[PDB]
Design an enzyme around this catalytic site. Structure first.
Site, PDB file in Angstrom:
ATOM      1  N   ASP A  84     -33.004 -35.373  33.675  1.00 41.37           N
ATOM      2  CA  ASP A  84     -33.765 -36.498  33.144  1.00 41.37           C
ATOM      3  C   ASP A  84     -33.144 -37.298  31.995  1.00 41.37           C
ATOM      4  OD1 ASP A  84     -34.140 -34.821  30.985  1.00 41.37           O
ATOM      5  OD2 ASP A  84     -36.181 -34.237  31.554  1.00 41.37           O
ATOM      6  N   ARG A  87     -33.817 -41.497  28.621  1.00 38.64           N
ATOM      7  CA  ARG A  87     -34.638 -40.380  29.029  1.00 38.64           C
ATOM      8  C   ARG A  87     -35.649 -40.991  29.972  1.00 38.64           C
ATOM      9  NH1 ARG A  87     -37.929 -37.175  30.632  1.00 38.64           N
ATOM     10  NH2 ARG A  87     -38.484 -35.193  29.628  1.00 38.64           N
ATOM     11  N   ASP A 131     -40.407 -34.615  33.654  1.00 42.92           N
ATOM     12  CA  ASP A 131     -39.636 -33.605  32.963  1.00 42.92           C
ATOM     13  C   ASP A 131     -38.909 -32.703  33.938  1.00 42.92           C
ATOM     14  OD1 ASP A 131     -38.538 -32.134  30.805  1.00 42.92           O
ATOM     15  OD2 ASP A 131     -40.094 -30.604  31.045  1.00 42.92           O
ATOM     16  N   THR A 132     -37.583 -32.758  33.911  1.00 38.73           N
ATOM     17  CA  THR A 132     -36.808 -31.874  34.757  1.00 38.73           C
ATOM     18  C   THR A 132     -36.569 -30.641  33.886  1.00 38.73           C
ATOM     19  OG1 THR A 132     -34.757 -33.001  34.053  1.00 38.73           O
ATOM     20  CG2 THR A 132     -35.696 -33.616  36.172  1.00 38.73           C
ATOM     21  N   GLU A 168     -34.940 -27.559  31.768  1.00 37.52           N
ATOM     22  CA  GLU A 168     -33.902 -27.453  30.765  1.00 37.52           C
ATOM     23  C   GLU A 168     -32.696 -26.650  31.225  1.00 37.52           C
ATOM     24  OE1 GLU A 168     -34.249 -28.984  27.607  1.00 37.52           O
ATOM     25  OE2 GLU A 168     -32.090 -28.600  27.866  1.00 37.52           O
ATOM     26  N   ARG A 177     -33.568 -42.158  21.988  1.00 35.29           N
ATOM     27  CA  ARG A 177     -33.263 -42.291  23.421  1.00 35.29           C
ATOM     28  C   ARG A 177     -34.108 -43.411  24.042  1.00 35.29           C
ATOM     29  NH1 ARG A 177     -34.162 -36.136  25.600  1.00 35.29           N
ATOM     30  NH2 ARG A 177     -36.268 -36.704  24.888  1.00 35.29           N
TER      31      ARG A 177
HETATM   32  C1  LIG Z   1     -40.250 -38.633  28.326  1.00 30.65           C
HETATM   33  C2  LIG Z   1     -40.572 -38.588  26.803  1.00 30.65           C
HETATM   34  C3  LIG Z   1     -40.124 -37.608  26.004  1.00 30.65           C
HETATM   35  N1  LIG Z   1     -40.459 -37.577  24.654  1.00 30.65           N
HETATM   36  C4  LIG Z   1     -40.123 -36.442  23.757  1.00 30.65           C
HETATM   37  C5  LIG Z   1     -41.177 -35.362  23.791  1.00 30.65           C
HETATM   38  C6  LIG Z   1     -40.357 -34.129  23.496  1.00 30.65           C
HETATM   39  O1  LIG Z   1     -40.152 -33.970  22.071  1.00 30.65           O
HETATM   40  P1  LIG Z   1     -39.911 -32.525  21.406  1.00 30.65           P
HETATM   41  O2  LIG Z   1     -38.555 -32.173  21.834  1.00 30.65           O
HETATM   42  O3  LIG Z   1     -40.015 -32.815  19.971  1.00 30.65           O
HETATM   43  O4  LIG Z   1     -41.017 -31.735  21.993  1.00 30.65           O
HETATM   44  C7  LIG Z   1     -39.000 -34.383  24.155  1.00 30.65           C
HETATM   45  C8  LIG Z   1     -38.978 -33.947  25.629  1.00 30.65           C
HETATM   46  O5  LIG Z   1     -37.712 -34.302  26.195  1.00 30.65           O
HETATM   47  P2  LIG Z   1     -36.729 -33.313  26.905  1.00 30.65           P
HETATM   48  O6  LIG Z   1     -37.306 -32.980  28.240  1.00 30.65           O
HETATM   49  O7  LIG Z   1     -35.497 -34.147  27.016  1.00 30.65           O
HETATM   50  O8  LIG Z   1     -36.659 -32.132  26.028  1.00 30.65           O
HETATM   51  O9  LIG Z   1     -38.854 -35.809  24.081  1.00 30.65           O
HETATM   52  C9  LIG Z   1     -41.150 -38.593  24.072  1.00 30.65           C
HETATM   53  O10 LIG Z   1     -41.328 -38.693  22.875  1.00 30.65           O
HETATM   54  N2  LIG Z   1     -41.622 -39.549  24.877  1.00 30.65           N
HETATM   55  C10 LIG Z   1     -41.381 -39.650  26.222  1.00 30.65           C
HETATM   56  O11 LIG Z   1     -41.845 -40.612  26.824  1.00 30.65           O
HETATM   57 CA   LIG Z   2     -36.216 -32.145  30.467  1.00 28.42          CA
END
Ligand SMILES: Cc1cn([C@H]2C[C@H](OP(=O)(O)O)[C@@H](COP(=O)(O)O)O2)c(=O)[nH]c1=O
Ligand SMILES: [Ca+2]
Length: 135
Positions: A15, A29, A34-35, A37, A81
């Site tokens: 993702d 992103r 959510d894919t 980790e 991102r």
């Molecule tokens: C898709 C997305 C992710 N995020 C944030 C939430 C998560 O934060 P935290 O890491 O602080 O929990 C993280 C998830 O992404 P990843 O799946 O890349 O980890 O990115 C947003 O803020 N808004 C969005 O629209």
């Molecule tokens: Ca992810």
């Protein structure tokens, strides 16, 4: 919404990727999904993580055209991102992953949820077909 051209720099995982956007390189992103980790030690390499990465990598590297489509709310997250719906030759990567059971609909933050129902319909189909994450 409105699509805009971008150029792939590097596929990172299922993702997240690096794209050349409006002259500058930045990480994107995928919105609403959510894919699993494959990087962060706290989550470890989750099941289907490597599979989701490969699917996305293949899809974006083989495309003639990549387009980013920001939603109506914030365009970047707290990590700087870009948040968008990404299309590879007109096909939405976000949906493609969900349809294959390689991602779950997640992080639904209004008003960045224009395609939520579409993605949810694809997730339900993947579930009823018991695909990957849902098997
Ligand atoms: C898709 C997305 C992710 N995020 C944030 C939430 C998560 O934060 P935290 O890491 O602080 O929990 C993280 C998830 O992404 P990843 O799946 O890349 O980890 O990115 C947003 O803020 N808004 C969005 O629209
Ligand atoms: Ca992810």
């Amino acid at each position: 919404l409105h699509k805009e051209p971008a150029t792939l720099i590097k596929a990172i995982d299922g993702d997240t990727c690096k794209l050349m956007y409006k002259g500058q390189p930045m990480t994107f992103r995928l919105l609403l999904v959510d894919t699993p980790e494959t990087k962060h030690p706290k989550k470890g390499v989750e099941k289907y993580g490597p599979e989701a990465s490969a699917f996305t990598k293949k899809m974006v590297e083989n495309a003639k055209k990549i387009e980013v489509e920001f939603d109506k709310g914030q365009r970047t997250d707290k990590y700087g991102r870009g948040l968008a719906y990404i299309y590879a030759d007109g096909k939405m990567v976000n949906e493609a992953l969900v349809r294959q059971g390689l991602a779950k609909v997640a992080y639904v933050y209004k008003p960045n949820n224009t395609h939520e129902q579409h993605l949810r319909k694809s997730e339900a189909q993947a579930k009823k077909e018991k695909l990957n994450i849902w098997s």
